């Protein structure tokens, strides 16, 4: 009873100190100052258990598990947006918006954090296929849009990128035509000129253009078609004009 | 119909917050009353522990506690387990404890009292003795801390009704 | 679903009522079976 | 819905401000007559019962 | 050590015992037979040994272990077959050259001859640790960790030594905890008693949806992650396809299959069928075997593994649920555990109860169903876990009024019955509203209706038409088709196709084993739209035989759209079910005129 | 001395007869933990007691026993409501003390709580068929009948959700104008059903005025059977001390009856027929002995236990043994729950011999007893004609069977269908019963007087 509250109190202060080492979360750290005060000083576990048994600290296992689950959800949401960095006020507004909700294990933030964590966890063990590169670029643009727009607000690009990454994650190795058509439709449906510019490296966009150039490359035997198709394999960025020029040649 | 469920959810959240504050206030008051009763009972054990350090006035209370612990056993041979500083007081009063125990006995007089060499704990038990049988299978807590803790369950409602009533 | 102690008392009266209803339906079916051909001969002539 | 984003932090302000004066008189009243019940409990604990 | 005074049957008496207990397990004889002290009589303690007594001499030494029978919790649980007594069945195939150990098999519960990949978790040196916190992880899943290294319960301290990333053995220690001095060395394997429940911070209500892989089961009354389900039926009700569909088509991170009274052929077929099936979530080679744990028993196996199979499976399911993953427990069956408890009560010489079963079946059955469920994971991280217990039952007395079926069905919250009339038609399971009930369908319909559901009206209308189909079939069978109207004949015609297509869930191919919510909602919406269109065409002027015979292959194509895997349309909704609404709407206009 | 043996859950220890009957004892183990137990029976230098926590962990020859010297008694006070407690003592929201100002026994030996008059104050639970057909009042003992296979936990969650809102509907009827308290005792219930039952009382707004007693299914049967005596002693102590109305809900009786069958397996007594012991009527009479009106002519303690039929009938020892101590019961039908109804309580197998004494003046009417008999006669005629209509058909049925068949379908989907948060009044239930009973002619109604039937026609 008291050991779980002491471990949750020490894990709350250790997670709060490991969340930000600059001390920028004064709003979220203001409510947890009673747990960080015992962690910022030389206090043994017997003094924390004796203080919790004497009514000098929090003794609610359900409230400490709910606040530790909310702080673990905020730390998992801030850690899942790597290698990007969100705003300081956006983390306090997202923590204040998540603290104002009664449910914290079946909400849209936990399903979106688990959905982004499934593609981010699957991105480190994917095989050599184009679905891992397109899902890596869409997970990078979805990570930049999730870091820019947050997890509490709604966005059509985050839902379309999460639905495209979730549908591409369930696909097998025999659906390269559906992943190439879904990547061509997702690249053609984007309003921006470059969805991978300023987020991924030039080799990742060159591999994505080389994937479509290699896929559309074994379909012509003419010198004029292969000569015009070979000129698009030297660009370091992917655009809709290259997909329209590649679709016009095929 | 789309608004009414959100209104009922907001009312349920407000009622849950008011019930949480209303439970936290009574939990704090119960923790305060239990801390006061535990403070008075903690001071009583410190007063009894301070009074138990005297080998002059503690001899009749130790002999009366040994006779009272021997009166609830009814065995022919009794083994008394006490501290290192209490074995000499029972050794200097075993004949008076056997004569006083035999003078008010209901079954028979005591044959002999065997002082065991095993001592009791000194971390949470200051003074007193532990009455045991010949086989060492039944023990009666005849200490001051166990007697005050056993009497605190019946003295807590009278002090709580007079102090918080 | 069903009872486990003293349940034959309803099945005995249900079987007796089913037997009496089957006997009455057999008597009415016999009377209608006689009257059907008894009218069918005179209708045939 | 706006009453649930500020009421979750007011549970400690309302619970501390609700019972703040009784905790001092409850501890003062127990420490005032503690020797009178401690002497009766010490006198009753020293007798065989 | 004690001396064996008498050995009669599966119970042995040993005298000179001063360390015996009521639930502690000990080893009797020189062969190390699996047994436990059930009772004591004076100075001697009666020990009931589930192993075979053929070959045990009287007068051998008996040494008590000093604790109850439990299992090992660590890396190596998945991809290995064991028994309910925490014994390695894979070592018996190499050493003894047999599937099950007949007798004299003294092997370790945890594998200590293979190395695993140990990686550090979210903890470091100097940080506080507690019981249930994620201290490490092992790559044993498709795309995520399966065997998470956690601390033992009722312990705390600080991590003094943290092992780096690499391969290590189970016997080697790579963890050191300091709490009030040198506490003890930490390793990969850990001990936990099976007679005590796993600790947790707090329990929560079950509110997550779970896919059972059945169109009639999920469409009629779907279960949640953390609920209890009972499945009665004589000679089973399709536990092979329901057990394989719950592991393959289930959305849980871990799957635990426990057989307490199986023959061994169904466990070997389901175990060998798991490596051929591929995971639909981007898995790897042997995806179903890596995330599945199998506990195999026999019909003539030991009673300690059969009775302790649900305790070891519930302890492993609670240990896997304590890390934050969703676990599904498929037990088959509780009738063999109740008969094993009645055989131990009759052999031990205890007082019996009504219906020939012991009195501890109610408390043990309520404790077995109460030991599983959804709650908060114990530890500093506060993760979310769930344990779905699905245990089938069978009639031991030959009727549905026995204490085994009524005791397990009364304590359970979800029910899935089996009709003998619907089971005789080659349809398993067959229950709409007479043997099936669920209280979490209201909260479970909020998420499936939140995505794109139509099941909220079609489930009540299909349950009402399925419940009225038996009442119409009773009067149609007793009196005839002369005292009924055309609406009851159209409702019985829609209930015949809905019962034929919804009740049949055995599957003749790989595409007939998975059942999504969109396909069942589209088929139930097409059947409800055809039933409403038949009533509207009958109200506007038409016949019942002209409506059903006029429909024909329009309903036959909807009934025949279950033999193909969903790979067309958007994600799971093929165009054949979408064009069936326009074809039925076009046929409904021509059926009126 | 030491533990002589162990047979099943109970252990047989050889000690002295210095301890009294039902005195608390402490078993000293060598593992470093002490356990508490209750003396179930005394013998000639022998004792049979069960451990309160756990069943394994004691020694054989190295065990130690000690007598506490005090009998089993729970401290009852006026601050027990609102907080969360356990039956065996698992503290999750409790502190070191329970706030008990007086010591009372868990059997009601010196108290003797029982009413010496008929109940006048009418109490309603928010059911038109239960309040109109039964006519329950304060101090009555009427248990709820359940079945195996149907949603008994949903009906108990609906009856527990209805507890708390009956005070505002009963205050308008002039049948209850005092304080209302709820006593919740759980034994052998699931954590999800107890969380939903506590969530229903928390959503209704009765968490501060209700007390929660939690008992697990993996614990001993002595703690689960001992928790309803402590809950009934706390409800009788709070209701008797302040003259308030306390409603006690005991769920489930099947867990106490199943736990009572495990006990007495190592004593001199033995079980009887069907696995249950022959002295279970005294065990249920001990829990039902503390039910009724309190002494003082102000306030009363009502008892509404929830029992589930394991065989779906009244011939079992649990519903048959518990139904004999009471004066009727309410039968819940699974056929009405299968077609869709909340609550699915039937009126055929339901009768109360205290409907005339419960109905008085100023809080009820006189035609409710004749309207309940007329509705029970019409429901029995429609249910009797419904079974005969399937075999023969609609060719041999008269207009009287069709009137009862239409009245059973009209009253089946109207009176049995109700909400889980709204409480219907007795006047609205009698007015709704008069509309369902107004389908036949005035000459075809003979279950009421002509003077009262002519005025309320």
Curated annotation (Swiss-Prot), chain B:
Alphabetical keyword list: Acetylation, Coiled coil, Hydrogen ion transport, Ion transport, Membrane, Transport, Vacuole
Signal peptide from the UniProt entry: none
Entry GO MF terms: proton-transporting ATPase activity, rotational mechanism
Membrane topology, record value: Peripheral membrane protein
Entry GO CC: fungal-type vacuole membrane; Golgi membrane; membrane raft; proton-transporting V-type ATPase complex; vacuolar proton-transporting V-type ATPase complex; vacuolar proton-transporting V-type ATPase, V1 domain
Principal location class: membrane
Subcellular location: Vacuole membrane
GO biological process entries: endosomal lumen acidification; Golgi lumen acidification; proton transmembrane transport; vacuolar acidification
Superkingdom, taxonomy of origin: Eukaryota
Quaternary structure, from the entry: Homodimer. V-ATPase is a heteromultimeric enzyme composed of a peripheral catalytic V1 complex (components A to H) attached to an integral membrane V0 proton pore complex (components: a, c, c', c'', d, e, f and VOA1). Interacts with VMA5; the interaction is direct. Interacts with VMA10; the interaction is direct. Interacts with RAV1 and RAV2 components of the RAVE complex, which are essential for the stability and assembly of V-ATPase.
Misc: Present with 16134 molecules/cell in log phase SD medium.
Descriptive protein name: V-type proton ATPase subunit E
Swiss-Prot record, chain C:
Range of the intact protein held here: 8 to 52 of 256
Subunit (UniProt): V-ATPase is a heteromultimeric enzyme composed of a peripheral catalytic V1 complex (components A to H) attached to an integral membrane V0 proton pore complex (components: a, c, c', c'', d, e, f and VOA1). Interacts with RAV1 and RAV2 components of the RAVE complex, which are essential for the stability and assembly of V-ATPase.
Record's miscellaneous remark: Present with 8500 molecules/cell in log phase SD medium.
Protein known as: V-type proton ATPase subunit D
Top-level taxon in the UniProt lineage: Eukaryota
Protein's gene: VMA8
Compartmental location: Vacuole membrane
Family in the record: Belongs to the V-ATPase D subunit family.
Job description of the protein: Subunit of the V1 complex of vacuolar(H+)-ATPase (V-ATPase), a multisubunit enzyme composed of a peripheral complex (V1) that hydrolyzes ATP and a membrane integral complex (V0) that translocates protons. V-ATPase is responsible for acidifying and maintaining the pH of intracellular compartments.
From Swiss-Prot, chain D:
Membrane spanning residue stretches: none
Top-level taxon: Eukaryota
Subcellular location: Vacuole membrane
Other information: Present with 2280 molecules/cell in log phase SD medium.
Subunit and partners: V-ATPase is a heteromultimeric enzyme composed of a peripheral catalytic V1 complex (components A to H) attached to an integral membrane V0 proton pore complex (components: a, c, c', c'', d, e, f and VOA1).
Similarity-based family: Belongs to the V-ATPase G subunit family.
Job description of the protein: Subunit of the V1 complex of vacuolar(H+)-ATPase (V-ATPase), a multisubunit enzyme composed of a peripheral complex (V1) that hydrolyzes ATP and a membrane integral complex (V0) that translocates protons. V-ATPase is responsible for acidifying and maintaining the pH of intracellular compartments.
Protein name: V-type proton ATPase subunit G
Organism field: Saccharomyces cerevisiae (strain ATCC 204508 / S288c) (Baker's yeast)
Residues shown, of full length: 58 to 106 of 114
Curated annotation (Swiss-Prot), chain F:
Residues annotated as binding ATP: 353
GO BP: ATP metabolic process; endosomal lumen acidification; Golgi lumen acidification; intracellular calcium ion homeostasis; pexophagy; proteasome storage granule assembly; proton transmembrane transport; transmembrane transport
Gene Ontology CC, one term: Golgi membrane
Locations listed in the record: Vacuole membrane
Record's keyword annotation contains Transport: yes
Repeat among keywords: no
Keywords: ATP-binding, Hydrogen ion transport, Ion transport, Isopeptide bond, Membrane, Nucleotide-binding, Phosphoprotein, Transport, Ubl conjugation, Vacuole
Membrane topology note: Peripheral membrane protein
Cross-referenced Pfam families: ATP-synt_ab (PF00006), ATP-synt_ab_N (PF02874), ATP-synt_VA_C (PF22919)
Domain of life: Eukaryota
Quaternary state and interactors: V-ATPase is a heteromultimeric enzyme composed of a peripheral catalytic V1 complex (components A to H) attached to an integral membrane V0 proton pore complex (components: a, c, c', c'', d, e, f and VOA1). Interacts with RAV1 and RAV2 components of the RAVE complex, which are essential for the stability and assembly of V-ATPase.
Protein name per Swiss-Prot or TrEMBL: V-type proton ATPase subunit B
Species per Swiss-Prot/TrEMBL record: Saccharomyces cerevisiae (strain ATCC 204508 / S288c) (Baker's yeast)
Species lineage: Eukaryota, Fungi, Dikarya, Ascomycota, Saccharomycotina
